[PDB]
């Protein structure tokens, strides 16, 4: 059972719109909209959407495996050793949000202050004292982007596993010599940083020049979750306000994916005429280049919808029916739809490019899709027993012999985390929250396993969060 | 009653060290150490200190008034109009942490997302709808440091008032014409940004070339809080670990101020031989240039303690008795004292230069001194009635006629805030926390009205904070 | 008669090596080595070579036309109007070294101080007074690289003509409206700067992703000058010193081109065994990325000569027989061949990337190939009559009615220049030298229509230039 | 006999304005205007002037000695050893235009390509082979401004000698240990780069905070050349065009110096009413901050001529009588006087800040004052014998035993150069021109020992330079 098996379960269901069914269905955690800062839906005038892993959720692990296979094949095509071809994607290893340290070749799980929570070299998990060799003070400057790359999106799951695969492979292949910062094979030296760049280069290449889009699009049912409730929610949003798309993908890929997402023999509800996906939007903007989009952007271009090519020159006209934009900036949306930032709820999965940047730079309201939350919620509810024991121990430790009491902490956190995978939960390692968890609470006003959970809330719900108090204020 | 009147009350008291007196005295809020993240004092090996507004608290409002007077006199000396001379510092206007917007000449109180909480143009407080003229979406990109200057330290209190004074004066002086971005007087145009730079230039100048140090040092009792409990706490720290000073001030000013802070006819306790302030420290470092200190720093220099001048050349020797350093970096301290970052508790008042930077860049533990917390606590406890009514209204608003219910919110927040001053509380505006409050919770592990509150806690106390849960985790 | 018709005339000749034949053949201007600063061939220990337009001269105008055709086809493929397809390359329009001004869409010929010598908007040559509208003071800051692009290499000849073609086409096509900085077609605006970037993008694309290499390599005789005297000169250099290749091209293209350059049924001289091109070199370095090569360079890589792919990792071994390098820096050559900069004579055609940068950054000796010099010399010798009249007028103008005397200057310069082409001589406009001419004299120690002219000079010739005197020094 | 002894000889002379006296007086080399590029005086509409070492020439060696003394005293005041106090300025050591290499502590004389011509470590002149230890290839990247500082103005003559003095002193003082990059004294390390920064800091300090202006102004006759022919030339320029001042000095210093330069009991000619210096100018601009002046500049300010302070705010009015400007840009002058760049002849002594930058960035015409040219001309004319022998040897060397022929070259260049000083001529070392000589020919259209030499040329002279030919063009 993958996490997209949960999302494709609730997606096979038409929506009963009885107002008592929605209110009851909503309270079940898998379908909740969780609230970090209060938000009055009545004050939202425009709903904006990312596409990949927001409107179009790729089925796991089929999709990660395809991208891992194509990336491996690209690396062998440029000179990496044939053995890579026998790697096979394993979804139980990687967790989103890890940090690859290009100096020492470790995958790290860190908290919001860059404290080490987990450290794996290949598939060898480094325990506390040994990590102090390379990380005295057990800490990284997580903003040193020359050394550290944060694998933040579901797109990075294949490379998260692949980096571990390569470090493992070269460590144990007798042709090579392990050094602190990479591998020697005679007179060639491959630094972990060189190796990491090649992987990054290869993932980009399969997305933009290799065959991943092609293989995706010729088997959409295998790779893309489709849900009849998406065209219903979009039309319901259009009655209360404006709806826009602002995606980084190009127009040809956007059109194929979006057409499939609406490929039902009805429109919004069973019985209605099907409508083209474009009619569900007041403003369609491709090639957005977020997060640069939320600063100065690029020049506003117009897509030739017939050919998929951009018209030559900078588009100067007004919003008009039928038009598709390329490039531009967030200010394109605000001007063309007559919106201020806090009239906008932007809905996306990139904690950095979609959410953090639209909040800090423009004051937009934010909705973070976290697809793994379905499986994360399952593990967290089912094995709540262990976390409750965790919190019990954490307190009796403070009253105080703790020779053996710290041992039961470190034991209990390990086996709690293992239920999620080898890199543990996306949101925590034991009693300690991750960087990712921290940025969710900090920059996502709302979050949910799927944006579809908005369908189960009335037109003008007021999402409510608890007010926050400083220590001295609750004294 | 200023906030330094509170601190100079508890400072006139010798410390009863009965372990039941400390535990009871400690529970009184004014003397608490408040905890944002748990901290095990037993694991702290080095205590490090800022000086100004940490070890040496300047009496308010005498000191702010002196700096305001000298800054005003400097501006008139370079050409500003004589009327400035009749300005007089008013401590009830400014609150620390405001943001001056150099484009439109407004002082702003913002929350952590840059949402406008208060907006004053001179002494005219701009209400909601009118702020939308200049701030559509009622938001600023608080990291656009070319436009926005955050007045963060107690040193900025005089210029916080002075900026309002000037905007007020030029607005109402018939010689000038108000424009959106400044004032015209015939063929001269003074932009708010030009004017702001002159004020900043003048404050620097009185601190580093004018007479402020001179007038301070020739009347230390008038300007500097002195507390017999400081040499006691320092010596107690020296028995459990190492103690260091790392201040931005130069050695001559540091020596005068520190000598006075120890100017008692006894040592640590009444009855003991007085010792020079230098003997309370294992490492003394002046000219630190924090926050650059916490990155690459500057070259390590050695102070000629006899002359107050720096020796020529880069100091290459070891830590040795008697030596004073200039420049260097945080890594100087770690090497020379054999410490990792989390063995260090650094104690200071600069939320940015002392606390935020030492946490994000080095993983140091942090203790934030907030001198105004004494008065803030008084107002918050005494007028708790109003905040309790505030939180009641905030909830019954969510159940729902709110024509009149929002009016009682906006009324009640105003008169709550007024009890603090015209710019309201340092930590909140009504039910909404400030940027400053947010950075306290985020980067200060501990905080307190005074670092002296550490004296009332046992040698190896474990400061405990509540563990944090994401919404879906408490579901 | 193109300029590569001259070079392919002298190239069809085997070399008579009688020492009286070389000395006599050498004195003919077409075969001279011209000298800007004295150079003692005996002190040269390494000869280094660029490839494209140095060892491999592309036949004109076949090659420029092919690149123009492919670039035009690429632009139409991305959306430019079909009419572009009817453009046809005209070799009589462009002169190398022109400056495209992306603001106003003009091709400019400038002197070393950026003074305007010629200004063409499309095919309309703008005369003096009208250029003052857009260029008051008739001058450009030629180092403002955001606005001005200097078309410096023979590779830029197709785009030099194409830029004029497009400006002409849009100016006169009634679908568009000419503005100061570009063209409007309804709601699309194409700035000259946008248009220029598209041309630059398209030329790069045909070189690195389109078919230009493919079409070149499948008809080498049509496109590439081949000369039996090249393998003779290379072997003669190898007896006095070391020989190296440092080209920006990749290894697969380098191998095809170089193999053809040595494709004779003999070796160095008729009668000798043919040898592979690689045996003529002590150090072969591809992917050089000059001029970055002459600063920090890139990492040294090793080419897998069997597959044409780079081996993975950084090459750490020594110079060894058979090895081909990728990347690296000029310091790779100096270390591996044991050379200082002034032991090196580097031979190339890029006045900036090959010559200027190797002189200013490393102190290398320099040999500039100028292929057009053959035709330039012909025009300059044959029509010397007119330049002699020019210099006569220039002086009698100084003795002084010059109403009519300036008119004969401006007339005589025009018809002198026209004998070269519509953009006039590469080296001058009338009595005024071009930027290009200035950088030749300034940074090329030697220059010549072909590097083959070195064959006609004895092993240890001392190339001699006149010593330079300041005005006050000849007083 | 210093070089300002020559300039103060011709300055004690009233100007006979007989047109045959000027034409004859002019031909004497000391009073020539030398011409690098032809210039038609009739086309000059504005004459612009620097002040220091242009209108106000400081008497040598009195002035350099005063600045050396004050700089030495400042260094001892901050901690340098007392022995510095016994240094005494020696005008026979330094030559303008040397390059201090902050890595190895050498003064270098270089040519335009950065080839080493002279290399002195302290007062030890390093001969060829030993310089190869630190400068393989005998070359420096003269644009690496982090390592190399070019001492370009007469203001740098005191520090040129002082740098040698310090390197000499520390090398030979037994308290210190010489290392490749500086000196050790126990646990202090003084790098040459640290030491160089202290000297630079100290020279700035005496100019802007110490007493150099004060001591200058209270003994102007001792320190400043005064010439009755200056007010005559200025008034003659005002009849043919506009005259402006654009100096980096502030208004109070400018007024003292300029007032003295006009302190005669007559006006332009003996017998005329004296006029204030300000009446000789159409536009006076102080605080120019050249060369930044020739790019974006700073904001235009207005000087309060009564107080010497800048008025508050940005000056927006027009050119009006009596007004003095501060800051601004070269475009201030062009707009306010209605000039294009080539209507301007700017007259100054800074080869970089005044001449090179105004030519490359704005296309201004240029007049370089070189005060040492008077003495340089004397040495060059009087000892022409030796340079003529030099050029004879340079040629017979090319015909060819040169074991002994190179020895007579290296001997003859040494004793030629010695007649100028220990660092030799400003313009050459033997047969090789210096960087400085090269930038004179390259960027100064005219040059002269004094700008006063313009008085001896008729109103609309056409300064004529020989036209330049490339090698292949004179073939
Ligand atoms: Mg996405
Ligand atoms: Mg402080
Ligand atoms: Mg080339
Ligand atoms: Mg000057």
Describe the structure.
The structure is a homotetramer of 475-residue chains. The first copy, chain A, has 475 residues and is an alpha/beta fold. Chain A has 2 domains: 3-58 and 224-473, no CATH class; 59-223, no CATH class. Chain A contains 17 helices and 22 strands. In chain A, the strands form 5 sheets. Chain A has a 9-stranded mixed sheet with strand order 1-21-18-17-3-12-13-16-14, sandwiched between helices. In chain A, strand 10 (182-185) and strand 11 (188-191) form a beta hairpin. In chain A, helix 3 packs across helix 5, helix 5 (157-172) crosses helix 6 and helix 14 (384-399) runs antiparallel to helix 15 (403-418). In chain A, 44% of the residues are buried. Chains in contact: A-B, A-C, B-D, C-D. Chain A binds chain B through residues 29, 32, 34-36, 113-115, 136-139, 141, 143, 340-342, 359-363, 373, 377, 380, 391, 394, 398, 427, 431, 433, 437, 440-441, 447, 462, 464-465, 467-468, 470-473, 475, and chain B through 29, 32, 34-36, 113-115, 136-139, 141, 143, 340-342, 359-363, 373, 377, 380, 391, 394, 398, 427, 431, 433, 437, 440-441, 447, 462, 464-465, 467-468, 470-473, 475. Strand 11 (188-191) of chain B pairs antiparallel with strand 15 (314-315) of chain D. The site of one magnesium ion (MG) has 7 residues of chain C, from loops. It is classed as hydrolase. The entry lists the keywords hydrolase. The assembly is tetrameric. The entry is titled "Human cytosolic 5'-nucleotidase II soaked with 5mM3-Phenyl-N-(9H-purin-6-yl)benzamide".
